């Protein structure tokens, strides 16, 4: 049952078994009910921990593979295995988002949440993609982020943490993926400035979340400019 799967995901989170947590959350989502704010966060935590693990491993391997040139075949083969596992996790998340979550989302907050998640997992795919596939992936991430930006600019205040986190990730996408440093800097500055103008009006519930993202936008700008 759905309630059992959510309890098990909460247990897997306590035990730090994120692949189990992701599997329980996938099953819960597949029951067909809308996810609550707590459940959205369980799903996000589960898959971001799994994919974050894979991305860090991929970066290690890819770094060795590059230094190796000046090889052997083992690094390429193993990097390819990690890459395939990462691609499968991203495809799982994206499948859940497209077949269950984006369509069935009630509020604008949940829709921005899911659309940001869609751009994030397409962005993770773009980090390891190479040819014409990379171009298709870049377009799909851009499209998810843009749809989310349009909704967040119309429905959420500029200090909202979902809006801020979205603008942060989309600016990372512009800089790192789309190779548009100017769009990245511009987006990050604008987001920071618009949030700064409303700083005194920020909700107490969002104090820690929003100010953190504001610090990250500022850190990225220091790094990019």
């Amino acid at each position: 049952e759905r309630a059992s799967l959510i309890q098990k995901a909460k247990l897997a989170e306590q035990a730090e078994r994120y692949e189990d947590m992701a599997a329980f959350m996938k099953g819960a989502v597949e029951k067909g009910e809308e996810l609550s704010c707590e459940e959205r966060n369980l799903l996000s935590v589960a898959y971001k921990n799994v994919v974050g693990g894979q991305r860090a491993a991929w970066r290690v391997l890819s770094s060795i593979e590059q230094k190796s040139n000046e090889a052997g075949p083992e690094v390429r083969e193993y990097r390819e295995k990690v890459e395939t596992e990462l691609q499968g996790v991203c495809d799982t998340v994206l499948g859940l988002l497209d077949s269950h979550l984006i369509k069935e989302a009630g509020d604008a907050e949940s829709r921005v949440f899911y659309l940001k998640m869609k751009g994030d997992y397409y962005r993770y795919l773009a980090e390891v993609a190479t040819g014409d596939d990379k171009k298709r992936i870049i377009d799909s991430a851009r499209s998810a982020y843009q749809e989310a930006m349009d909704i967040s600019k119309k429905e959420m205040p500029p200090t909202n943490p979902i809006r801020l986190g979205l603008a942060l990730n989309f600016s990372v996408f512009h800089y790192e993926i789309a190779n548009s440093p100017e769009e990245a800097i511009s987006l990050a500055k604008t987001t920071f400035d618009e949030a700064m103008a409303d700083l005194h009006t920020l909700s107490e519930d969002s104090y820690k979340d929003s100010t953190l993202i504001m610090q990250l936008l500022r850190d990225n700008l220091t790094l990019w400019t």
């Binding site: 979902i162 986190g165 979205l166 942060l168 979340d209 850190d219 990019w224």
Partner: peptide, 8 residues
Amino acid sequence: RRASAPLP
């Protein structure tokens, strides 16, 4: 390394 949005 650049920052991306932290966990909700």
